Design a protein around this ligand. Sequence first.
Ligand SMILES: *[C@@H]1O[C@H](CO)[C@@H](O[C@@H]2O[C@H](CO)[C@@H](O[C@@H]3O[C@H](CO)[C@@H](O)[C@H](O)[C@@H]3O)[C@H](O)[C@H]2NC(C)=O)[C@H](O)[C@H]1NC(C)=O
Ligand code: NAG
Ligand code: NAG
Lengths: 151, 303, 185
Amino acid sequence: KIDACKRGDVTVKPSHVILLGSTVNITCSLKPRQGCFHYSRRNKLILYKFDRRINFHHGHSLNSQVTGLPLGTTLFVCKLACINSDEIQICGAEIFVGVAPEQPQNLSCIQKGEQGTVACTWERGRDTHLYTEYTLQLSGPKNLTWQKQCK
Amino acid sequence: AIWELKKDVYVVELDWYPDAPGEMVVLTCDTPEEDGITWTLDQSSEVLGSGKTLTIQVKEFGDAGQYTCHKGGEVLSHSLLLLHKKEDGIWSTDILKDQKEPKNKTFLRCEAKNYSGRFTCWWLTTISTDLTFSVKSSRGSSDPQGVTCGAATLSAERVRGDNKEYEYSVECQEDSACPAAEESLPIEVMVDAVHKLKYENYTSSFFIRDIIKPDPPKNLQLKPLKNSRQVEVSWEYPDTWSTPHSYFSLTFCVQVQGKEKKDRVFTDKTSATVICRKNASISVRAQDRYYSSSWSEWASVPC
Amino acid sequence: MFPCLHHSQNLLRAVSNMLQKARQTLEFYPCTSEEIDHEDITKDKTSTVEACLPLELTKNESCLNSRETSFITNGSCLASRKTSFMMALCLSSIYEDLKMYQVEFKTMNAKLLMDPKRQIFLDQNMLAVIDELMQALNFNSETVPQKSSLEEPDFYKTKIKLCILLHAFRIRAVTIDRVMSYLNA
Ligand SMILES: *[C@@H]1O[C@H](CO)[C@@H](O[C@@H]2O[C@H](CO)[C@@H](O[C@@H]3O[C@H](CO)[C@@H](O)[C@H](O)[C@@H]3O)[C@H](O)[C@H]2NC(C)=O)[C@H](O)[C@H]1NC(C)=O
Ligand SMILES: *[C@@H]1O[C@H](CO)[C@@H](O)[C@H](O)[C@H]1NC(C)=O
Ligand SMILES: *[C@@H]1O[C@H](CO)[C@@H](O)[C@H](O)[C@H]1NC(C)=O
């Protein structure tokens, strides 16, 4: 099992996907066996957003509450700085701030010629910063429907 | 703390800040019990302590040296003391000098010329006398007696600035009998530098392929094509390089600039044809074809 | 000219281009050879590390451990009566190495596509080259089924694991290329 994170694990509350406006509790925690080889009150456990320092705790447990996150993805990486050795990246979290999806206001289906494949077009609306899945369903007079997903 | 580098030698770790209290150090002698053992530090007959046990905090370098266990007029045992200074919680690094060519804090530079596993490590130190080095090596930590490092030897005495840095190198051969296609563990080399009463240690981890540096191309000869301006040049693989030459391959870069800025041409083939200006030399270089390796020394034939 | 050697040379070149793209795309994620540890998924499963050696190098044969994973799958790369068992076991182990990597790479790619943006995705050409080489190596090639997930995974962990695999795979690709060159000559 390749493990991306060994020295320590970082958790996010409630989740990596959050509604625009919500506040995430990024918490960097270090496993007891791993740590700075020489205890010293100089080593720190920094947390960086886009390589920008947001917090620093000498103790293994680091707690942060980032707020006003804009729409998009922010990489919070939690590195360990020892006394003389260079910083070792320990673990990180990628947060996607998103909003509720826009409903398609107008739907039009056009078939080209007497023999043609029906094609339906919609107005997506504002782009939510999240993966979007679109399902188009066509039902005839009685209920018999064709199911197609635009992943 | 106090630990034994070797029998009768005890390295003591001390913090280095002004007016520092010393660690309580206890001296013991493994000899038949004698009532009245005396203890000396200097060659002078000044007697430091009596009894089979001597207590002396090593607050400074003066308090570290060969304590002598002597009773009855015969020296029962010997207690040499070595010091590992720690400054601001960081181990001292004074004996060797930082080359810095790969990156900062680099004191050991190792190289190889073959996939056999024979490699040599060069360290530059500016201390002229009273210098000894202990070298140990292993593949990862799993192999016991994995590598058979040889003994440090002074190699050169160059005059950089006025310091006259002296270069000391070791010859180490991977003693693993089983051949293996790819390496999963980096070879680790530790040099236990010792100077007078001061002890330092340096650790370097590397892979043979990364440190490999090929020797210059062999039997380079120029053969002019009949009735043509261009001249064919043919070279051969070095004998020292590992065999077979099919599994392990090299890439030759040919520069004809001699004495227009860059005539370098990269040819896998052992013969390339280059127009020869009468007033220039043609030179060839060798690198591992498969992975990025240090370039070989230029081989130049007059043209 | 050896056709499998041409596929192996194509494989090493494809990995080299993908590795360069990965370093450029993931600027913050650490993907330099110095900061990425060497971890090989096929550490104990396959005997490519020992079986794939020049005939001159391997002699005692004691180190080949009890014909480990000695499937000896017959294939179009060599001929059944053409080469010694030492190369027959090696070709089978190389096929197994490519199968272990392709199954993992497809799993990573399926997770990467879900990303709202398209920062990085595994090269389709590189995956195709791995499949083509496996088809020549063993007649009973198994094509990996399209992989997908019904949920969204953390992306940072996938991007760190990706860099660790790419570098290890590149070393494996050179090892395959050396064996193919030896078979040709
Ligand atoms: C490089 O230099 C350092 C400086 O001394 C060495 O660290 C020291 O290593 C010794 C030997 O293990 C430790 O002494 C003994 O350790 C064992 C195992 O923990 C213990 O059972 C003994 O009671 C005693 O403590 C010493 O504690 C340790 N110093 C520190 C600060 O950890 C290191 O071994 C040297 N490396 C080489 C390759 O020479
Ligand atoms: C974040 O954590 C703090 C303290 O751990 C707590 O007071 C707060 O309610 C938490 N907020 C969320 C959104 O989890
Ligand atoms: C067809 O489906 C619609 C919506 O599900 C429902 O209102 C309608 O009664 C259905 N008709 C039949 C014949 O089932």
